[PDB]
């Protein structure tokens, strides 16, 4: 018979199967739709989760209970060392999907990039990419001309530089960033120009821009149904334990449906979360990257004592409003919005007054070690 009381199902069937992700790196399922009118531009970037802090910003929402008051918001720090463009991939449309016409490479690739092709780089003689890079310039131009003639989707292969981060990993994460913009000719020229140089975050993203974040959630091994799906605990009197689903299906159909929550892997899931706003693109060069006009102190983004479980952010970074899936050190793919947003949140010009740099270990009271030593005075 029917349920006595109706309540919505536990969890979303749109994130099935809740299995471990195939890879650690976040993978773009689909790039933003190409607009021919816009000039050629990159559409994605990769960084690493460093940690979280909180900022103070003045609200400019008329008719809101906050409005002219200053509020505190949590933010995520993603260290974004400049990416390196090393390749070009041409895609053409077929009834079977997108087909690679060819990928051409730059004249030189770094050992960091080459390490990604090796499971044991230390004991190998590192012969990868050693003789295919001497291809003639005429053949390169032939392949590029054929790409221009027959391809409709252009992607640039670019890789991270983990040596610029505190990561123990040395092999670079390499991905394809789709070039969206003008004609095929303009796209090819745009990528050819920076076929070998660094790609900083600032050329891909602007401040106060909404982006999507693609990453892999924090792993938790196999978890019970209570934690994995949020089902209600059975009463204390339950004979064979209470942390489970009581009825896993009616008599008929004489099977267990795939919609029934069960114990299994929780976390380490691929997730694409939309509409994270860039609050600040902090440059590596300037020493006041964490300073504001209302603070005028000289301090960088890294909290005193370092970012817990990550290290020190010594490179370009961006301050994302809110939270982002993954652990510290996790590679995080930043993607441009699939369609540009015209909402007031997306277009708002953020004016942040204070960026916290107190110790994230324990309850830090000071923003800088200099302030700490000044407050305490001389010791033994």
């Amino acid at each position: 018979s029917h349920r006595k009381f109706e309540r919505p199902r536990h969890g979303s069937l749109g994130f099935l199967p809740r299995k471990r992700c195939k890879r650690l790196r976040g993978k773009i399922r689909s790039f933003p739709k190409d607009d021919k009118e816009k000039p050629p531009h990159f559409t994605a970037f990769m960084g690493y989760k460093a940690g979280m802090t909180h900022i103070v910003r003045e609200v400019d929402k008329p008719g809101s209970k906050l409005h002219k008051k200053e509020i505190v918001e949590a933010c995520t720090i993603i260290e974004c060392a400049p990416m390196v463009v090393v390749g070009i991939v041409g895609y053409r449309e077929t009834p079977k999907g997108l087909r690679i016409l060819s990928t051409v490479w730059a004249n030189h690739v770094s050992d960091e990039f080459r390490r990604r092709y090796y499971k044991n780089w230390y004991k190998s003689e590192k012969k990868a990419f050693t003789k295919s890079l001497n291809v003639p310039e005429a053949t390169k131009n032939c392949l590029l001309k054929r790409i221009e003639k027959y391809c409709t989707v252009l992607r640039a292969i670019c890789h991270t530089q983990p040596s610029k981060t505190p990561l123990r990993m040395k092999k670079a994460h390499i991905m394809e960033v789709q070039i969206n913009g003008g004609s095929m000719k303009e796209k090819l020229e745009f990528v050819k120009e920076m076929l070998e140089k660094n790609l900083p975050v600032s050329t891909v993203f602007n401040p106060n821009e909404m982006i999507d974040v693609i990453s892999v959630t924090k792993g938790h091994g196999t978890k019970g149904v209570v934690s994995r799906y949020g089902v209600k605990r059975l009463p204390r009197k339950t004979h064979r334990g209470l942390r489970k689903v009581a009825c896993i299906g009616a008599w008929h159909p004489a099977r267990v449906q795939f919609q029934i929550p069960r114990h299994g892997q929780k976390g380490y899931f691929h997730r694409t979360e939309r509409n994270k706003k860039i609050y600040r693109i902090g440059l590596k060069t300037d020493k006041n990257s964490a300073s504001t006009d209302a603070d005028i102190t000289e301090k960088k983004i890294t909290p005193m004592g370092g970012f817990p479980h990550y290290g020190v952010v010594n490179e370009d970074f961006l301050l994302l409003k809110g939270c982002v899936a993954g652990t510290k050190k996790r590679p995080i793919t930043l993607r441009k919005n699939i369609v540009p947003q015209v909402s007031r949140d997306a277009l708002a010009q953020v004016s942040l007054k204070f960026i916290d740099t107190s110790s994230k270990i324990g309850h830090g009271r000071f923003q800088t070690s200099e302030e700490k030593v000044k407050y305490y005075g001389p010791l033994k």
Binding site: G63, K65, L66, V72
Partner: protein, 132 residues
């Protein structure tokens, strides 16, 4: 006349005994239902500072007892975050008896009143002596 209350951490579920903190004659309020609460299967309706609830008084004037009446929460002992950055909590739970339209039945508030409740209920703030 503006009900953009802004979310306050839910305290005081159904069955909570709070103080009256007014001169209406009642001494305590037994929260009975929370106005605007929707449908969740085993969820107890719960109230926050600016919330209008339905209550009965268990101690106070006999003329006030044994009846269903409206109250507005004014003081909440559970810590809630206001957006300035910090957390706030009173040391007791208290609400005032009001007409369903939101106008007080008593005339004065004993202790401090939360600013969030005060700006939601204007004529309540006038009776409030200290708005914190």
């Amino acid at each position: 006349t503006l009900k953009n209350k802004m979310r306050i951490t839910l305290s005081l579920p159904v069955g909570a005994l709070i103080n009256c903190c007014d001169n209406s004659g009642g001494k305590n309020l037994y929260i009975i239902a929370v106005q605007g609460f929707g449908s969740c299967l085993n969820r107890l309706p719960a109230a926050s500072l600016g919330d209008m609830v339905l209550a009965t008084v268990k101690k106070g004037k006999p003329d006030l007892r044994k009846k269903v009446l409206n109250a507005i929460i004014c003081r909440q002992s559970k810590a809630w975050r206001r957006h300035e950055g910090y957390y706030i909590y009173f040391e007791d739970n208290a609400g005032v008896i009001v007409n369903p339209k939101g106008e007080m039945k008593g005339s004065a508030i004993t202790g401090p009143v939360a600013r969030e409740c005060a700006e939601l209920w204007p004529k309540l703030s006038s009776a409030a002596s200290a708005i914190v």
